[PDB]
Symmetry: C3
Subunit: 302 residues, 3 copies
């Protein structure tokens, strides 16, 4: 009946420890859905619907072949039901039916992680687009039996497009705007739920010489990302999050509800900024993050 | 001088029989273009321009090296000329020049299927975007000499974006809207020409344990699909319809005027819904289909 | 120390000579940024911001391991600063910081081309989107140590979306429109800076039987291209400009700020038109180019 393991799920930029076991296990994951008002941008508030308090949800890391047992709780203060659809799960709605949880209630269910990959998980309660648009999406990494190559640093990044009634910058609590959502005209396109979530004081950090791996998800609802890191090149790209590996790519497409894994070695100090290369989203809508690399200067490289 | 064979072209969800011959042949295909009003959605009618009566056109299945002889007929009642551009054909407009057919006339021409792959074919009469937008696109599968691996079930799925004058839901006969087409703002995004074409009573059917292959095309005119099947994972993906094969992909990009071949084994009963994961298209514009899988329950999977 | 070779850069359709050396070198490149008014379309003028007088900039061709020394000059008549971010360069802004050049000034800096590939380079002065949108982008091809396979013809093609205040066709000098840029609603989508740049008398030329390679870039700012050549099929596609090679692809995605290398043999005479298969961009917004192939007819093909 498999060894029991309490999963270590991480809040985002952080990734759980690499899997140091070579046998299947039942991994217990606890998830709670809570609705809360937070800052989208300076002076701009939004009513986010979250998985564990923020956007994206906590990253789950398991091994191919594991049984994932989820204890799904919908906070008592929630105003609507919530559930979870794991793209990593095979079967009815990816777990949506089994995890339909009204406020103040807890659901439990398990699924076997049959295939390795970087999968998006999100709420699938009607209206599906609204539950996703309000921030209910995260990533679950299903490692191959053999595991992934060691890397110096790992980051959890999820892009998403938000639809605000007021336009970008309008002060105050901004409601979700269904019409802009349907027309695919977001006001904010950000990494990890807020403008600046991965910038300024919250910038990611690495040291010169380190090999960096970024687990990049795209919660959508609607946009497709042309992911790029200014100042660097992708040594490796797990195309669309699958087994296929591309090399020397400057910018990759991350499908809606899809992902990608990028790896690059940062050999020289400086500030590298992650962006959706559909450029105006980055410099006008918030799809901008920073990777600060400390260390010492090599004039030969630049 | 090559044996002559009358091809079997199927209406959509269905795929023609796998090629059971290991020698080149001249495959005779008969195509007719007919304009007709049909139901886009409940109470919503649209004037479709079709290849053989519906959207998409009939799927053609040939073998690499075959000579495809097309007898192209434009129905007497058509109001405009029609032709066909096969992405599988090498040469002037992919056959567009040779197949320019006025109403009540018949054209004939042949081309050699030089390269294996899943190719889109569509009308290319000016204005090209309008002819495509009204539904004139289908898929031609060109099998490799050695043929494709046996599979239990095969489905013909083609996504397309439609531009209606009224907004989604507006009752009555809705005219094509050029302005929305140019701005890439469709009202309907559907699989196989109509909302629900592959859902409800028209849902695709398979049995638990069967390996399923879906020939997925994207007629456009403008959108790019983040194809995904809720509840399942792609075991194999012929990237962009070519020779390259990816594995364990949750969601793939299907280029405009492009395709993809996805294969997955359905091991547990239930309802799986195909969607464009640019989510609002699926739950708000119609890009939603269903694969009903009967059989017996495996709790170990979920 | 390394040898010093002056680089041979080319204006677009043309590609520099293949690298005929098997040792590292310091390649001197001279670039000048000049702002000038040119014809976007018949009767339509636009104030382009360019790298060396046109869009795209001159193509640079170097070898993996080379040190690229850039003498960057901002023409005295320019009204704003300009710099360059090479996606091929590893380090601070891809050279943006070191190349920030006010009008009438010259900057110099060097970087080591560590990785092979087809890279986009563009201006990164605030506001970044505007500098890119006005035409400041080009390609730098970094050949692998071993070099790329010989081909009969090579073409330099870069797609880009332009945001005009007036709508497509509006006569006169059309100003950049920030609002359309942010909403990702371009008026013109073209290959090589202007409508018709690669068509009519400016059509690309090849002879029947020749193997053709196209270095395709996508300067954006915002669109993603579903690159396709009507009448032909891609024998090889360097996926997203990386090492990975796909085959028998009808249409590939070229990411914003990304690229692709496509190779195909043109075996039969005729006119082949390159397009963004998000069709309305091609036939309504200008994303249309032509490849005129000379030679002699083969009815066995079509
Ligand atoms: Cu929810
Ligand atoms: Cu860039
Ligand atoms: Cu999903
Ligand atoms: Cu037509
Ligand atoms: Cu086409
Ligand atoms: Cu500039």
């Amino acid at each position: 009946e498999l060894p029991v393991i309490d999963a270590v799920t991480t809040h985002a930029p952080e990734v759980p420890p690499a899997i140091d076991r070579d046998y299947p296990a039942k991994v217990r994951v606890k998830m709670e859905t809570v609705e809360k008002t937070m800052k989208m941008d300076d002076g701009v508030e939004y009513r986010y619907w979250t998985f564990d308090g923020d956007v994206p949800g906590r990253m789950i890391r398991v091994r191919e072949g594991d049984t994932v047992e989820v204890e799904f709780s919908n906070n008592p203060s929630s105003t609507v039901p919530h559930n979870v659809d794991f793209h990593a799960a095979t079967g009815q709605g990816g777990g949506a039916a089994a995890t339909f949880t009204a406020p103040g209630r807890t659901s439990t269910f398990s699924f076997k992680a049959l295939q390795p990959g970087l999968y998006i998980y999100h709420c699938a309660v009607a209206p599906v687009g609204m539950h996703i648009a309000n921030g209910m999406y995260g990533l679950i990494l299903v490692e191959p039996k053999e595991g992934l190559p060691k890397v110096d640093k790992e980051f959890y990044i999820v892009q998403g497009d938000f639809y605000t009634k007021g336009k970008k910058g309008a002060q105050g609590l901004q409601p979700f705007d269904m019409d802009k959502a349907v027309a695919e005209q977001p006001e904010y396109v950000v990494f990890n739920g807020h403008v600046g979530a991965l910038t300024g004081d919250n910038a990611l950090k690495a040291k010169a010489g380190e090999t960096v791996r970024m687990y990049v998800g795209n919660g959508g609802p609607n946009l497709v990302s042309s992911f790029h890191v200014i100042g660097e090149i992708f040594d490796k790209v797990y195309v669309e999050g699958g087994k296929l590996i591309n090399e020397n790519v400057q910018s990759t497409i991350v499908p809606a509800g899809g992902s990608a894994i990028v790896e690059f070695k940062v050999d020289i100090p400086g500030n590298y900024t992650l962006v959706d290369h559909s450029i105006f989203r980055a410099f006008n809508k918030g799809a901008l993050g920073q990777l600060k690399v400390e260390g010492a200067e090599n004039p030969e490289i630049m």
